[PDB]
Amino acid sequence: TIEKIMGNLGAADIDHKLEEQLIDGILYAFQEQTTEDSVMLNGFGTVVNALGKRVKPYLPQICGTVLWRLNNKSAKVRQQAADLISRTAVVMKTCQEEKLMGHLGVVLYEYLGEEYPEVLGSILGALKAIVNVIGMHKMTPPIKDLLPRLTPILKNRHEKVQENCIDLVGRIADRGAEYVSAREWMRICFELLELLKAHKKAIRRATVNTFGYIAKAIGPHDVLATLLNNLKVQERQNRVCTTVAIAIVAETCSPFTVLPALMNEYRVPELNVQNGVLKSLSFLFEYIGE
C-alpha cells in the first residue's frame, strides 16, 4: 500500500522525521524477510526512487546494513542484499556520492569469488547496475582490472551466472572497450564460442550481441575467421547462432569487409559449412534490409 501510494502521489509531502521513520521501517521490513518477497523489493526501489535526493543522510546506514547482511550464513540473505544493491544503485548515483558507490564496487569485486551460483549472479547483476549508473572513467575498480576478473567467470555452467556475466561483458564491450587489449577480447570470443552451446535463448542472443560489439571494437577479421572455424568445426545442435553472430558482425562492420571470406568459405566441401554460409547470408540480408 505504501509503494502504491508513493507511485501514485509521490514523496513531496514527506516530512524529515517521517522520512527517517520510513527508512527505519523499510530497513526493518527488509531485515525480516522470510519468503522471496520480490514485490517488497520492488516497493523498496519505488520508495527510495520516489525519495530521490533526500536519502543522502540515510545512505550510509543503508549501505552498512546491506554490507552487514552480505556476510550472512544463508545464501538467500546475500542474494537479497545484492538484489537491494542492484535496485538502489540508480538512486545512489543520483546524488553523485561516488565514494560510497566505489566502495560498494570494491566490496563486490572482493565478493566476486563466491561459489554459490544465485549469489554470484546477483553480485554480477549489482555490478552491472553500478557500471551502468557510474560510467567507466570513475569506476573503482577499473575496467582493466575488472574484465580479467570476469574472464574465468564465463567458464561457469550455471545459467543465471552466464546470463548476468554475459550482460555485464556486453555492457562493457559496447561502452568501455578502450581499456582492454585485443588479445583479451579474442580470449573472450574463444570463451563465447563455448558459451554458444547453452540452453536459454536469451544467453545465445546476448552472446551474439557481444560478438558484434567486440567486432565493432577491435576489427572484424580475426573474429570472422574464428567464427568460420567454429562453423566448420561444430557439427552439432548449435552453430546456427554462429551464422547469426556472423551476420551481426557483418551488419555492424560494413559487410563488404566480410563477404569475400564468407564467399570463399563456400568452396570448402565439408558438407555443413556451405549451409552455414547460406544461413548467414539469409540472416545478413534480413539484418541489413535495403
Does the protein bind another protein through residue 111 (CB under 8 A)? yes
Closer Cβ to another protein, 31 or 254, answer by number: 31
Closer Cβ to another protein, 151 or 252, answer by number: 151
Q: How far is the CB of 156 from another protein (least distance, A)?
A: 13
Query: Which three cell numbers, joined as nine digits, stand for 163?
Result: 546470463
Of the candidate residues 56, 69, 158, 175, the single one contacting another protein (CB under 8 A)? 69
Closer Cβ to another protein, 12 or 271, answer by number: 271
Q: How far is the CB of 151 from another protein (least distance, A)?
A: 4
Could you tell me how many residues of this chain bind another protein (CB under 8 A)?
38
Residue 251 near residue 211 (C-beta atoms within 8 A): no
Does the protein bind another protein through residue 152 (CB under 8 A)? yes
Closer Cβ to another protein, 51 or 85, answer by number: 85
Closer Cβ to another protein, 11 or 23, answer by number: 23
Closer Cβ to another protein, 54 or 197, answer by number: 197
Q: Measured between alpha carbons, how far is residue 194 from residues 165, 167, 201, 209, 223 in Å?
A: 14, 16, 14, 15, 14
Which residues within the stretch 131-150 sit at the binding site for another protein (CB under 8 A)? 144-145, 148-149
For residues 278, 283, 288 and 290, what is the CA-based torsion angle, rounded to 10 degrees? Answer: 70
Of the candidate residues 17, 53, 73, 137, the single one contacting another protein (CB under 8 A)? 73
Residue 271: other Cβ atoms inside 10 A = 9
For residues 43, 46, 48 and 52, what is the CA-based torsion angle, rounded to 10 degrees? Answer: -170
Q: How far is the CB of 285 from another protein (least distance, A)?
A: 10
DSSP of 204-261: HHHHHHHHHHHHHHH-TTHHHHHHHHHHHH--SS--HHHHHHHHHHHHHS-TTTTHHH
Q: How far is the CB of 238 from another protein (least distance, A)?
A: 8
Of the candidate residues 21, 33, 42, 71, the single one contacting another protein (CB under 8 A)? 71
Q: How far is the CB of 12 from another protein (least distance, A)?
A: 29
Residue 16: other Cβ atoms inside 10 A = 9
Which residues within the stretch 157-186 sit at the binding site for another protein (CB under 8 A)? none
Closest CA to 70 of 104, 32, 98: 104
Does the protein bind another protein through residue 56 (CB under 8 A)? no
The angle, 0 to 180 degrees and rounded to 10, between the axes of the packed helices 182-195 and 222-233 is: 20
How big is the chain, counted in residues?
290
At 260, the amino acid letter reads P
CA–CA separation, 118 and 10 (whole Å): 33
For residues 127, 133, 135 and 138, what is the CA-based torsion angle, rounded to 10 degrees? Answer: -80
Residue 267: other Cβ atoms inside 10 A = 9
Which residues within the stretch 217-236 sit at the binding site for another protein (CB under 8 A)? 233-236
- x/- string (CB under 8 A) for another protein, residues 13-32? ------------------x-
Of the candidate residues 103, 158, 175, 216, the single one contacting another protein (CB under 8 A)? 103
Q: Which residues of this chain interact with another protein, rule CB under 8 A?
A: 31, 60, 64, 67-69, 71-74, 99, 103, 106-107, 110-111, 113, 144-145, 148-149, 151-152, 187, 194, 197, 205, 233-236, 269-271, 274, 286-287, 289
